[PDB]
Write a protein that binds this DNA or RNA. Sequence first.
RNA 1: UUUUUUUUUUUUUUU
RNA 2: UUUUUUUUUUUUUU
RNA 3: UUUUUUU
RNA 4: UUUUUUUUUUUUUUUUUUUUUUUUUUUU
RNA 5: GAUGAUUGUAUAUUAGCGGCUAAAUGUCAAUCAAACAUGCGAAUUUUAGGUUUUCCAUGAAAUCUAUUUGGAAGAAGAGGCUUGAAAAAA
RNA 6: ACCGGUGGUUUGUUAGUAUUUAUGUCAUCAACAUGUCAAUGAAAUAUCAAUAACGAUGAAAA
RNA 7: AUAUAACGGUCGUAAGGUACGCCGGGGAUAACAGGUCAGAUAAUAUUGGGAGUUCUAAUCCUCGGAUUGUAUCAGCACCUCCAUGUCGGCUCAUUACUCCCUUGUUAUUGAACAAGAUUCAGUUAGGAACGAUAGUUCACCGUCAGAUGUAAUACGUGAGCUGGGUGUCUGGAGACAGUUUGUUCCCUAUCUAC
RNA 8: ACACAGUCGGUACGAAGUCGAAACAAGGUAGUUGAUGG
RNA 9: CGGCGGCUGUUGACGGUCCAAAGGUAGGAAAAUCCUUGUCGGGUAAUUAUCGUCGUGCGUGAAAGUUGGUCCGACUCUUCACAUGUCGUUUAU
RNA 10: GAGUCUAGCUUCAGUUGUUAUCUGAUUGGUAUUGCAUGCCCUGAGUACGUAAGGAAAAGGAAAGGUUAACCGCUAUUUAAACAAAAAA
RNA 11: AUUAACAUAACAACAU
RNA 12: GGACUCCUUAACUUAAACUGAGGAGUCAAGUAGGUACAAACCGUACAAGGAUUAAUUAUGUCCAA
RNA 13: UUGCGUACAUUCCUUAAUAUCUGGAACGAUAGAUUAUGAUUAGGUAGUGGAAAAAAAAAAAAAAAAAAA
RNA 14: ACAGGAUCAAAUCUUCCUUGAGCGACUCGACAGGCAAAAAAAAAAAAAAA
RNA 15: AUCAUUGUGUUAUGGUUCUAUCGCAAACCAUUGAGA
RNA 16: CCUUUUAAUUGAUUAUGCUGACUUUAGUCCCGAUAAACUACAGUUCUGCUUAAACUGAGGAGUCAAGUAGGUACAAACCGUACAAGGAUUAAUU
RNA 17: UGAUAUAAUUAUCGUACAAGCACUCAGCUAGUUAUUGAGAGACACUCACGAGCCCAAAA
RNA 18: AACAGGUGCCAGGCCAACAAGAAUCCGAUCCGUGUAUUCCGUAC
Lengths: 78, 239
Amino acid sequence: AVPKGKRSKHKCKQRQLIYFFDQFDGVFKRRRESFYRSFYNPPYFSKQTEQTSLPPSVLRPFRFPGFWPGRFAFKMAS
Amino acid sequence: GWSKVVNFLNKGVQRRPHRRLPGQPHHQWNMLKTQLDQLVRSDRLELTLPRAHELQQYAEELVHFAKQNTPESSLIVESMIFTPAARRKLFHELCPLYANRPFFYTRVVNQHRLRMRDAAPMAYLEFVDRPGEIRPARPVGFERKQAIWEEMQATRRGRRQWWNHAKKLGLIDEETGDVISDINALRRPSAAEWEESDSPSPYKMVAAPKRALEPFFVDLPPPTERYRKQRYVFKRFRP
RNA sequence: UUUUUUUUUUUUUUU
RNA sequence: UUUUUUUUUUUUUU
RNA sequence: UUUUUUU
RNA sequence: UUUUUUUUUUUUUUUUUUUUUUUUUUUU
RNA sequence: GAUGAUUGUAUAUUAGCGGCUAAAUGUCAAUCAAACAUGCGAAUUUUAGGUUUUCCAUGAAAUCUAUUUGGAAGAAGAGGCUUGAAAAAA
RNA sequence: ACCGGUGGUUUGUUAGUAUUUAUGUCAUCAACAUGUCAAUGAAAUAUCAAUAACGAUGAAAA
RNA sequence: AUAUAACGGUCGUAAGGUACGCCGGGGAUAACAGGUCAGAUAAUAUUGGGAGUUCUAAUCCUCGGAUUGUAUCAGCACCUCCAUGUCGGCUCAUUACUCCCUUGUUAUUGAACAAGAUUCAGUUAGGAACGAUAGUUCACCGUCAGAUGUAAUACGUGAGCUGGGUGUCUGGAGACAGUUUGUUCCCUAUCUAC
RNA sequence: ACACAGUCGGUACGAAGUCGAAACAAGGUAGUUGAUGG
RNA sequence: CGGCGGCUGUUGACGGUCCAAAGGUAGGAAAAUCCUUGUCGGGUAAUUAUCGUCGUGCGUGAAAGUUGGUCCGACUCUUCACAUGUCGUUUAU
RNA sequence: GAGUCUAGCUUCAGUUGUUAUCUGAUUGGUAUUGCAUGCCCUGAGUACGUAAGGAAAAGGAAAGGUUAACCGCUAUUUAAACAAAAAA
RNA sequence: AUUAACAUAACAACAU
RNA sequence: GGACUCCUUAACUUAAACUGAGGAGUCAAGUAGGUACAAACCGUACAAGGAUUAAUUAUGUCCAA
RNA sequence: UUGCGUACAUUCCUUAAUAUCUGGAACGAUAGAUUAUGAUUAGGUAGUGGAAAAAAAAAAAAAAAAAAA
RNA sequence: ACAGGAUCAAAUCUUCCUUGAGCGACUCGACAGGCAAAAAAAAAAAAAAA
RNA sequence: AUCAUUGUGUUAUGGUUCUAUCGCAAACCAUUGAGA
RNA sequence: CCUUUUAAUUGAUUAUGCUGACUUUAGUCCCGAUAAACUACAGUUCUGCUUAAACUGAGGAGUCAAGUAGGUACAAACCGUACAAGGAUUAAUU
RNA sequence: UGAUAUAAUUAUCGUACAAGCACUCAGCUAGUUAUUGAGAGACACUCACGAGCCCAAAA
RNA sequence: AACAGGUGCCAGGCCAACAAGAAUCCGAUCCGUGUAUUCCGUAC
């Protein structure tokens, strides 16, 4: 078949939000949760990229130093 | 797509036991066969989660039929390997290993990450009770009994919880109604050990943790470092 | 006997 | 006028 | 807010 | 072990089977 | 079909008022009963499309002869329009 | 009054202007591709200083 | 002194085909489908006459008029406008008629029983098999006897399929068949005033 | 929005007070009551 | 180098008359032709489809090419045999 | 405010069709049928009829056909072939 | 540097 | 070289919105109103323009009004 | 019996009239300030007629103008 | 709910009245569960303890 | 003056055509130089 | 400014009009036959096809196209590549 | 919330309406001209001179 | 037409080898050939 008329702006607008919700509920939300789980485990290290990549690490940084109690740095030795 | 079709179509649909693979059955079986040998030769492989959940089915059966030590079983084992190196390893390092392990010699670990080039899940298929394992394995056999006894002797709660179970294993003295004192009395010889048959040399080997060391130095990289080759070669474009 | 007709757009026929 | 009443009838003329 | 029915 | 008619069973209920919705709340 | 009106190849001939044609109006630079390019040889149409700001005054016909008379009013003639009015007390 | 040199007017403030080449076709043939020789600014012989901020020149800037 | 008798007068005694058909503008394929029309004709009832001849109405044939309706034939306009003998079959369907069988015990009957004929009524219940020849469909022929088996819907149905002649299309809006957590669990929602 | 997505029309502050309500009349004191035998 | 026929009388050898250059020869014949069911026989539970035959129903027609023995066949049709989801009516990998 | 089960409404075709009087201690007073193809059996060789011939009330059953459901049996197709011993 | 069509954002609204 | 209606009338199946004539209105080129729903029928003191006003017309007077 | 609803006023206010005949052959006049009870008026396809506008360019007329500066 | 009320007043076991129909019935008040992993024809199957 | 909320109003950003001369006689006029 | 003139060809929602931009259809359609491995003490993965010999005294048995298409850092850039006598008797030097 | 209302354009007897074009915007685009014509009962402006008016090409 | 060029944009009196005012007032930044007034050169 072939379209008989042109689609209005309103319809498109509606469709936009429809699609956005559709995608968000099924892709993005799942991906976010999957991403966030990996934090507990050590970061991933690739052998191929060893030529340029930084050494491996386990420890995670703290993005919010304002709510970071306890010592931050150690005093230099004599 | 729409993300709704997936749900609409899936209603009243049964799950497949064996995951489909690209190619004819004859091809699929070949693929799985070769991957089993490659898994035997490495100790851990990095594969997609669906595939990792599929190869583990044959990974268990290979070791299950390798321990029988029968002409019949030997045939089936033969029918599942390609290279001699995998046969050698299976029959000389893995069979002695899982002497006391009833089953479950492998596991699957999810990486919770997506491929850069494919956006696909990833997982590790590693054997159990191997050097450099992701996580430690539980004891079996007399080791298990010793662990249990230790647990029991630790605290009261353990004693109470293991009371029933301990009876079967014989860790409770029926003549006094108390946990056995000496645990070494329950030691028995395993299959893995060597049965009894019944120097001032300068070339004597030196004891060391995996294998002994020679009293001489040989200029040779490790087995994994004496054979180099380009992983991939660029293919120039033809505009 | 009459008021009530094609009032055959609907209800109603309340006389 | 009587539950008499698939095409069957009675009573009374309202 | 019905009419008519001679002597 | 699965599917199917080429096998087997019923041919009853309709105020029944079933169901997405408690309603004295007249200006959320 | 494949021992024969077999297949295949370098370089060549036939030019539109034409040639080719074991004869189809089949083919001649992927819609040839008459090819393609150019034209101060500056293309014709009773059919048919379009025809751009406002206000005001006045205001049609589908009838007649002729055209060997047609039809979806073609052309020519006649006919049809601004003539009048409508302002009053013994 | 020929001939050489210099200057001005009209054509022409009202008119208009083209030289190089990417692409089509066997050929004839057809054709106005892509702003300017160009950061911007009258002046760059004003474009300084640099680590965040405040600072320099300029009518106007990061 | 001939023609123009096509006599408002150029006849100059100068004709046909194209299923090889291009261009321009109009809607007509050689039964003029549909709608409209209702001549023939169809439904119900009625009257005249002829059968049943004892008997005009158990039942059957035919005539006139009136009402309703239009299946089919002829005719066909100014209206309409797709491509065909103005459909043959397959798939999938809706509606009306007391519609082929099953109901009205028990008075309409030339109804002894059995098997039969005409007419009417419901709260509209359950059912009705194939083949050969392809002469576009009708009389008839052979089998199971499922037991005398009609119309409308654009041939019902061709962006669902097709065949020996009496084109193509990947579904935007209606409808129909499936499916939908929620007051919150994406983001945002900042009084009163001294 | 039912709409060829337009036009006409479109809300009447105080008592949300009260130490008022007195120069009608009556009054079960309610800031109550006024006609009527079908 | 276009083609080749009327009345009437006894199934009718035969008789009258008109016209013309001559007045369809033989063969084939329900047909690459008339007619979309001509009579009879062979096949099938049914054959109008098709073969054989009759030669009237209309008609064709001889170096216009007619008829055809034997041989031959990418030419129509009848009929026999094996297997077969073409099928009533649809399944599984 | 929240969980469960539910009342009312809705549902193929379609209808408004039901109960005077009231056993005196005498074995007691309507009751789940709307519906319907063909053939066979009891009723029955009876009603009917010179003869031939040959019914109904009710129930019971064997084919054929439609819808729906299911895998106990049969037929077609097809898959699987692995952890009892704490001496392991 | 540059009009319209077209594309995105901010603010403004309560008899609901 | 005209579409509907009124009177007369030719043709046709006293058929058809056909085909064709004689003379009046309307539309064509006419608004708003009535006739339920789409020019032709009735009425009009019939649309230069603006506002919150009075009227016998077709015709109506139970409800939608 | 007597009733009633209803479409259309140029009553009020503001415009217009170009084929010789609307008073007007009037009045005014230094190039017209629109008539107050003024008569006929102002639906319109085809065709015909009148009038007002379209920001621009050219021209050798952009300071004799109150008050204030 | 035997919760409230009357009486020269109820067998153990409330004579009688009120609760409009004790909020349609039961029950809860740290009540209830969307998404993820894993499993998954409808449906069912996990106590907490990194 | 109907945003109930998917609308409208204002404003802003983005998009958006593209012109800087490298030229100006063979005709006419005036003036000047040598020689007739 | 006003006034006179103007051969400007001087007037737009529409000719499926010519030359451009930007929406809708519309995150719809389109994806070519066979892969895998590169480890924690040795090794030979599977599959399709089957002219892959380069002095042996002999110029690998030919033509044509590429207007230089198997050189080069996981470069669509820059920079190179055609020797008919085969230069390396390069059996030496260090 | 109440009342009311059939996109636009051309042809046509016929608002004919299920006929023809157009998604939208920007630029271009369709009555041009009397040294030669004119007032003819369907429509014809104005200036000068006057029984007299104009004067062509050289210049 | 003092369009003869340039100087930051409209110059008879400024650069351009030969005449003629750095003229006065006004000016948002902001030079300013611009408005008003006035002088002078010219066989340009």
